[PDB]
Amino acid sequence: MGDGVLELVVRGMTCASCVHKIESSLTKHRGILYCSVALATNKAHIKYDPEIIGPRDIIHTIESLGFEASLVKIE
DSSP states (O other): OOOOEEEEEEEOOOSSTHHHHHHHHHHTSTTEEEEEEEGGGTEEEEEEOTTTSOHHHHHHHHHHHHSEEEEOSOO
16 A cells, blocks of 8 residues: 555566566565566566665566666656
8 A cells, every 4th residue: 555666667678578577576575565667667666665675675676687677666
């Protein structure tokens, strides 16, 4: 409920694959509330609370997995 939206533009990606890699991966952090990786806009719309997980924590994990990841925040 009004927790924290987090559009990371994920510079990299391709088609599928990278998508569910991100989604499946970061959802393992029990502070990610949701992970919509809009390939269409090369963007992880993550939903998270800042309290139990920092945005950088997720970002590190994303960039590490395949990418560069920048919290544009609704782009």
